[PDB]
Amino acid sequence: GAAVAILGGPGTVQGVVRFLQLTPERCLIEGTIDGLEPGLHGLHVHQYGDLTNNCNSCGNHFNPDGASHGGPQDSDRHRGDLGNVRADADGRAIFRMEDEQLKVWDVIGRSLIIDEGEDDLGRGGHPLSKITGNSGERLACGIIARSA
């Protein structure tokens, strides 16, 4: 399957992220997000795509396996933990990745969200490291939709 997520939020920060399930156990994720402060910004899929209350109603990190926060490449990680994304000097974050635990059929209807700052991939030894990665505040989210 194929998907897309139109990000946005309070003021700056907004972009587009598409998902394409190339095969039954590996997914391609490509997207661009402008308006971000140069530097790393965590990226995660949250349980819901309900933006009624903006990104506050998006629920928490999509985590079916009941794991703990981790890195994309980590094993013990939330299915929705896409780790970080780097916003170059221009404040533009462009990326492409092949996460193989996050499937298009498992995240449609949900949401993609970028945070204030860097995700410490559950290794920051902060009360929130193992929970969110202490990525800070959610500044942009989009509902992961079905696409052609």
The pair of three-digit structure tokens given for residue 105, joined into one six-digit string = 């059929």
User: If binding is defined by CB under 8 A, does position 42 make contact with a second copy?
Assistant: no
Q: Which of 39, 91, 109, 124 binds a second copy (CB under 8 A)?
A: 109
Would you say 126 is a known binding-site residue? no
Q: How far is CA 122 from CA 51, 73, 88, 130, 135, in A?
A: 26, 12, 23, 5, 10
Would you say 46 is a known binding-site residue? no
User: If binding is defined by CB under 5 A, does position 69 make contact with Zn ion?
Assistant: yes
Name which of 18 and 69 has its Cβ closer to Zn ion: 69
Window contacting a second copy (CB under 8 A); options: 32-40, 80-88, 109-117, 126-134: 109-117
Give the integer Cα–Cα distance in Å for 33 and 140: 9
Q: Which of 148, 89, 78, 88 is nearest to 113 (CA)?
A: 78
Q: Which residue has the tokens 């780790």?
A: 83
Name which of 41 and 110 has its Cβ closer to a second copy: 110
| Breaks in the chain after (C-N > 2.5 angstroms) | none
Window contacting Zn ion (CB under 5 A); options: 14-22, 46-54, 72-80, 91-99: 72-80
User: If binding is defined by CB under 5 A, does position 81 make contact with Zn ion?
Assistant: yes
**113 in Cβ contact with 137 (< 8 Å):** no
Q: Which of 18, 41, 46, 78 binds Zn ion (CB under 5 A)?
A: 78
Q: Which of 20, 21, 37, 51 binds a second copy (CB under 8 A)?
A: 51
Give the integer Cα–Cα distance in Å for 92 and 109: 26
The site for a second copy (CB under 8 A) is made up of: 3-4, 6, 16, 47-52, 57, 59, 108-111, 143-148
